[PDB]
């Protein structure tokens, strides 16, 4: 072993006639003739082969001579092993032959020398990689050339999904994918995600590429299992230098997902600038509805950022539209109280009063929410402190369930009635004790008058579903 | 040797105040219209109108042709011919921005627009309105 490790041939000679044995093996599992084919000496390989060396041996972690000659880039140990008896189809530990362990680096003349004699390139490893997925990742050119003078074909993919066109665009190698678009790699090349050449692309960042893809006359509109396009995968990690020219190049205008979803809810979720005015040139509509009925316009309210109240203006939506809930933009400001994008809102004129499908106003949700916040800024729009819900319940009955004690005490103060019966005969006294709440029930029991009834159905008020 | 045309406008729908493209007949060897119902009409032969001849006439006299263009949608043909009626002085630059939205609006068929309540038509201002 140190004789190999340190390329001495002159004392190989005694220790082999003298005695020894090839077969022994280091706790790698390694043979003399593994070392001197790591090495690099010729001599050593040469007297222990004379010896009587086995040519085919398995290491411990499960590699082969060849595979190591082919790993450390040696031409004339590559040459006399294969000379001399072997065979490149042999698998690992890990089924990879000395093609994959080869392009696993890109040596040029060992595979040629390999390819020379009989190989089969066409071949699966561990994962089923092609030798032309593990080329993929090197971005070496003609690699690939040689790969394709033997007619690998990219119509092969790997369990995943993935294609070379995918690991090409993966780790973005341009002149990689100038090599392989004269090997017409199919543009409906979908893994079970479902996802297109585009969307790598959306996702990563790599750019240069998109050009590449519309050298073949690529498609924008291309839809997998969820229905997504490359400018959903595009917003959904945005790099905006792509889209800004897909949409002159045909983009989608008002494509929707399986969830119904558009990009201009999404943009507007995760707050930007240029999207939205980039999908408003070219034709973004925020009153699309969802397969629950809430538009761009909504979702976008909800988060309720700083420059979405200024963009909203310039695109025409109903003010206040209602979902299946009943939901008006007012309904989801109030839900995530934001007194900025509320006031605004109320500057463009919606309806202080809005109530819901079921009868719940602005207020009762504020009430559920307790932000008294959100009652002041409703209370300066002149929304009714008394506003009964359809079932009888009132500002008071709903802070009381919600227990927010502040928000009642601001109620009552402002004129808020505490003695209205609901459909169930509780007043906020008798919720305030059913529930336990002591601080609220010592204001509502006093300013409540006597309970209209002798007697427990809760109040909670709708949210759209996920 | 027998084709399809189609004709959209620009309207407006009484679900909510806004500007869309709704067509309003078709054309197989005959016209074919359809009212506020969504239904439409049995086939007949088209009939014309004096001003419409007049000026369809005026217009086409000096109408900007492209022929055999390199394109692949509705988008790009809408860039090349806003360019092109900037390159003829057809109309002043600073229209297309307005223009571009115009020609970019969802074009929508019939079975949506009972959901929709019908549609009537509406005029483009310069704001956008």
């Given at each position: 072993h ?34 001197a084919?790591?090495?690099?000496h010729?001599?050593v ?14 290491t ?11 790993f ?5 140990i590559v ?5 001399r ?7 690992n530990?890990?089924?990879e ?8 680096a ?9 390819l ?13 990689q ?5 080329a993929?990742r090197?971005g070496?050119?003609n ?6 003078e ?5 119509n092969?993919?790997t369990?995943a999904?993935?294609t070379?066109?995918?690991i090409?665009?993966?780790e ?5 994918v100038?090599a ?6 199919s543009?409906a090349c979908?893994t ?6 585009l969307?790598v ?9 998109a ?7 690529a498609?924008?509109?291309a839809?997998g299992?969820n229905g997504?396009?490359?400018?959903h995968?595009?917003v ?8 800004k ?8 205008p008002?494509?929707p ?12 979720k995760?707050?930007?600038?240029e999207?939205?005015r980039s ?10 509805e ?19 109240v200024?963009l909203?203006?310039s695109?025409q939506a109903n003010?206040?539209?209602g979902?299946?809930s ?9 839900q995530?109280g ?7 809102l ?6 202080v009063?809005?109530?819901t499908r079921?009868?719940?106003?602005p207020?009762?949700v ?6 008294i ?15 009964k819900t ?10 009381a369930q919600?227990?927010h004690?502040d928000?009642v005490?601001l109620?009552?103060?402002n ?16 919720i305030?004790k059913?529930?336990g ?13 006597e ?5 427990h159905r809760?109040?909670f008020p709708?949210?759209?579903?996920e | 040797?027998?084709?399809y ?10 679900k ?14 005959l ?6 119902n969504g239904?439409?009409?049995?086939p007949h032969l088209?009939h ?6 007049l000026e369809?006439?005026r ?7 492209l ?7 509705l ?5 090349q011919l806003?360019?092109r009626?900037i390159?003829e002085?057809?109309?002043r630059?600073?229209?297309?921005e ?10 929508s068929?019939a079975?949506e627009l009972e959901a929709?309540?019908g ?11």
């Amino acid at each position: 072993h140190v004789a190999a490790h340190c390329g001495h041939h002159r004392v190989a000679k005694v220790l082999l006639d003298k005695g020894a044995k090839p077969n022994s093996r280091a706790l790698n599992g390694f043979t003399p003739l593994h070392i001197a084919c790591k090495k690099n000496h010729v001599r050593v390989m040469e007297l222990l082969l004379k010896t009587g060396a086995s040519i085919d041996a398995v290491t411990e972690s499960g590699l082969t001579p060849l595979h190591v000659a082919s790993f450390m880039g040696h031409l004339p140990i590559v040459k006399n092993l294969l000379q001399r008896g072997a065979s490149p189809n042999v698998s690992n530990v890990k089924v990879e032959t000395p093609l994959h362990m080869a392009a696993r680096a890109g040596h040029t003349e060992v595979a040629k020398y390999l390819l020379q004699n009989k190989a089969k390139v066409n071949a699966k490893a561990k994962d089923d990689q092609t030798p032309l997925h593990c080329a993929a990742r090197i971005g070496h050119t003609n690699m690939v050339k040689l790969l394709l003078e033997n007619n690998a074909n990219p119509n092969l993919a790997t369990t995943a999904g993935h294609t070379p066109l995918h690991i090409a665009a993966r780790e973005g190698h341009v002149e990689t994918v100038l090599a392989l678009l004269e090997k017409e790699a199919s543009q409906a090349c979908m893994t079970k995600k479902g996802f297109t050449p585009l969307h790598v692309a959306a996702k990563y960042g790599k750019v240069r590429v998109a050009e590449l893809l519309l050298e073949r006359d690529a498609h924008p509109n291309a839809a997998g299992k969820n229905g997504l396009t490359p400018l959903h995968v595009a917003v959904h990690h945005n790099n905006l230098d792509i889209v800004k020219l897909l949409l002159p190049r045909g983009g989608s205008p008002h494509s929707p997902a399986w969830n119904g979803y558009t990009p201009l809810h999404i943009a507007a979720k995760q707050n930007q600038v240029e999207v939205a005015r980039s999908l408003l040139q070219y034709g973004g509509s925020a009153n699309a509805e969802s397969v629950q009925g809430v538009t761009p316009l909504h979702l976008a309210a909800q988060e309720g950022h700083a420059e979405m109240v200024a963009l909203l203006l310039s695109k025409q939506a109903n003010g206040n539209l209602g979902n299946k809930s009943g939901l008006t933009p007012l309904h989801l400001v109030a839900q995530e109280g934001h007194v900025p994008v509320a006031d605004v809102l109320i500057k463009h004129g919606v309806m202080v009063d809005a109530t819901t499908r079921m009868g719940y106003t602005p207020l009762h949700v504020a009430s559920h929410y307790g932000n008294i916040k959100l009652v002041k800024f409703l209370l300066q729009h002149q929304a009714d402190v008394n506003a009964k819900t359809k079932l009888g319940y009132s500002p008071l009955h709903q802070a009381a369930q919600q227990g927010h004690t502040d928000i009642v005490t601001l109620l009552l103060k402002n004129g808020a009635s505490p003695n209205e019966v609901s459909s169930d005969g509780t007043t906020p006294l008798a919720i305030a004790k059913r529930l336990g709440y002591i601080s609220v029930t010592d204001v509502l029991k006093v300013v409540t008058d006597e309970t209209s009834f002798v007697l427990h159905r809760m109040s909670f008020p709708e949210t759209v579903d996920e | 040797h027998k084709v399809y045309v189609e004709l959209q406008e620009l309207v407006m729908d009484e679900k909510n105040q806004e500007l869309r493209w709704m067509e309003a007949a078709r054309w197989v060897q005959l016209e074919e219209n359809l009212g506020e119902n969504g239904a439409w009409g049995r086939p007949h032969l088209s009939h014309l109108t004096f001003w419409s001849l007049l000026e369809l006439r005026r217009v086409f006299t000096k109408g900007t042709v492209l022929l055999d263009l390199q394109e692949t949608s509705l988008a790009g043909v809408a860039n090349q011919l806003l360019d092109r009626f900037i390159f003829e002085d057809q109309i002043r630059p600073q229209d297309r921005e307005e223009l571009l939205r115009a020609l970019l609006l969802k074009h929508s068929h019939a079975g949506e627009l009972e959901a929709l309540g019908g549609v009537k038509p509406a005029v483009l201002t310069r704001s956008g309105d």
